[PDB]
Amino acid sequence: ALFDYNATGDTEFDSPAKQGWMQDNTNNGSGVLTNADGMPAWLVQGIGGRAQWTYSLSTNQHAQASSFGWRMTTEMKVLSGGMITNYYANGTQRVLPIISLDSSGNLVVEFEGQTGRTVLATGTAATEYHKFELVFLPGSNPSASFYFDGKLIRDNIQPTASKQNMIVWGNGSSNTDGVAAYRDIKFEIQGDVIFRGPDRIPSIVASSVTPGVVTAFAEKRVGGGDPGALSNTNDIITRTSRDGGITWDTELNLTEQINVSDEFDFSDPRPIYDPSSNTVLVSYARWPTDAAQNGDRIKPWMPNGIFYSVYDVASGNWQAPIDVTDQVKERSFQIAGWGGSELYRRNTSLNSQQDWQSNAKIRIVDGAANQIQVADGSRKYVVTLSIDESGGLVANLNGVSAPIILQSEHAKVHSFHDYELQYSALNHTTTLFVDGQQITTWAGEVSQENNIQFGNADAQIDGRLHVQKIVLTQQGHNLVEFDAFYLAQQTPEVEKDLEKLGWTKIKTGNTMSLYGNASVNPGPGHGITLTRQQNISGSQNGRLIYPAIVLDRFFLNVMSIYSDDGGSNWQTGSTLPIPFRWKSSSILETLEPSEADMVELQNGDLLLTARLDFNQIVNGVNYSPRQQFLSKDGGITWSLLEANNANVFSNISTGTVDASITRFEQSDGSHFLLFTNPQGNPAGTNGRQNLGLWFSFDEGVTWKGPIQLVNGASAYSDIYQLDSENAIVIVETDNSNMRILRMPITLLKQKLTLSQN
Ligand SMILES: [Ca+2]
Ligand SMILES: [Ca+2]
């Protein structure tokens, strides 16, 4: 909440007594509107009496002040004298900087109960107007810092005693003369609640093109609780604030339109701000009101999906939501030949002296020895697909010795591709066609196998493959035809068990195979738009991107869902590489990266923070409750940042929670990242208390100590640069209520950059 005064120029209303303040003078002590050379302001005249303006707050207001903090900002001109007292006080302590001119005319500072005197300016600057800032950070061991003109003067100001309770400005001594023109005075009590519990899961972003427009989101949870409860209906909500986050328009439910009968639950509003059209693009997930992610009760045949809504910042209108599940929710039969070998065979009766046609739509997620095999009694044709240590798709054909680069662009390296095999009886050979691309021709080994076969061969070679369709035709008739895409999405009634459908499952060691994708969830915070992709291979500038959560069936992981199209068309990248281990038969041990956030780094690389959801230790190697991953290709594939997990943040909370990360861009040119997360009430604990904020000046290699932002409940949070000096912050606190913080990153940064001895 704000409390200020300012020189409007007009008569009647430029009086602090108009702008809500109180008069508190003693004889001769006067005030008056001055406008020196067009400089409108309130002149305080503490000649032979005190002239000072007060303002009185409520108990709850001071509590809020103690919980989330405050900041005081004064733009004034000290004309003469001393005991210029601009400060705040609550019934038990105050912070009192005394602004005055020394016998030598220089403007100087001194703090109550604090040894030392500091010259602010000298010469004729000493009577110039200046910016004066008092900044208070809540803590068990609190403090405040004082800034003069964006520089930091004193820090660690220990609060002293009083029983005075109010905000005050002017000359506070009756016996000490002081004269000053105040062009502006601002008092801000931090966290105004914008969204109330049990609504949860906020995110936020700001316009850079229309300075001041901020857009916040959360989940309207009617009944409270995570999506999937028969006892709730969750929707998405927003609030915009055209003034930096001071006031906010009415709460808008973007979803009720979409969910007529409240048959669905929506979740995870992940918006992205797009500078070219100057729009917010929010993406969020839908689930049926009775099943979702939790307990993995969500099935590929329920209404899980992803939808977006576009907000026109220029005219403040919203466009009805658009569904894009199709483009981003894969439907396929999936085979994970990790620590196992899994194969599906269909015995066929192909007349090998006559022609035949083979078609399979396959996608290689990772590894090798995933393969397709046609055998017509006499001979065998085998295409072994595998991914390079360079991240390229390669093909080993049978009998052949030389592998064939199949794809270089990482994006194509992990996308679907129609592999065709054309058999010519005539000259007794076949040819390979990857999406119209005639590759090679060859005559595989001789056998007595009359087969159509696919899967992962070696039990000692890990690979994973996803099938969508398989067909085999001879002389104008389809012998075999399997469409995973179609069945995946079918209700249990529709028979999809390969075995029962005709195939022979052949598997050694442990594997896992499933139909389609159970659900996609965009994620908690905000998304970005990439701008440093020019020297990155195959990525582009203007890419809209965000790390979504995929639930295959049982295990959760994260992938990118992006748009090089500006947003009309969407893509999907590979999943995070996780270390796996079978503790026993049918007992798998891996991580499950969930709530995730990314920042585009200076060189173009992508930096991701992900929360580790069910089990964080694999092979005795502990993974904190959080891990970082890096992508050097625009978010197509990632690589784990070994030993870049929770521990990277001193004093972070050992609990598992959602955090946030962003880029902060200084007008002067410099930049860095801002990172939010709770700390726990005592030294790095498992508790959602005292949200902190780390920075990183070296591009996420390291981070610098958590500066505390809150004293109390701190949960999910999201941060985004408001303007050149500010970062607005949105968190969950008491009873999950979501509060707003307007941080001055430019000033706070300084509490970390100085070296003293
Ligand atoms: Ca529900
Ligand atoms: Ca987040």
Curated annotation (Swiss-Prot):
EC class: hydrolase
Predominant location: secreted
Record's subcellular location: Secreted
EC number(s) given by UniProt: 3.2.1.18
Domain of life: Bacteria
Pfam families named in the record: BNR_2, Sial-lect-inser
Keywords: Calcium, Glycosidase, Hydrolase, Repeat, Secreted, Signal
Any coiled-coil regions, as ranges: none
GO biological process, one term: ganglioside catabolic process
Known cofactor(s): Ca(2+)
Record SUPFAM superfamilies: Concanavalin A-like lectins/glucanases (SSF49899), Sialidases (SSF50939)
InterPro entries per the UniProt record, alphabetical: ConA-like_dom_sf, Sialidase, Sialidase_fam, Sialidase_sf, VCNA_lectin-like_dom
Record's note on what induces expression: May be controlled by sialic acid availability and a growth-phase-dependent mechanism.
Active site: 226 (proton acceptor), 595, 716 (nucleophile)
Assembly, per entry: Monomer.
Function: Cleaves the terminal sialic acid (N-acetyl neuraminic acid) from carbohydrate chains in glycoproteins providing free sialic acid which can be used as carbon and energy sources. Sialidases have been suggested to be pathogenic factors in microbial infections. Facilitates cholera toxin binding to host intestinal epithelial cells by converting cell surface polysialogangliosides to GM1 monogangliosides.
Listed name of the protein: Sialidase
Organism: Vibrio cholerae serotype O1 (strain ATCC 39541 / Classical Ogawa 395 / O395)
Lineage: Bacteria, Pseudomonadati, Pseudomonadota, Gammaproteobacteria, Vibrionales
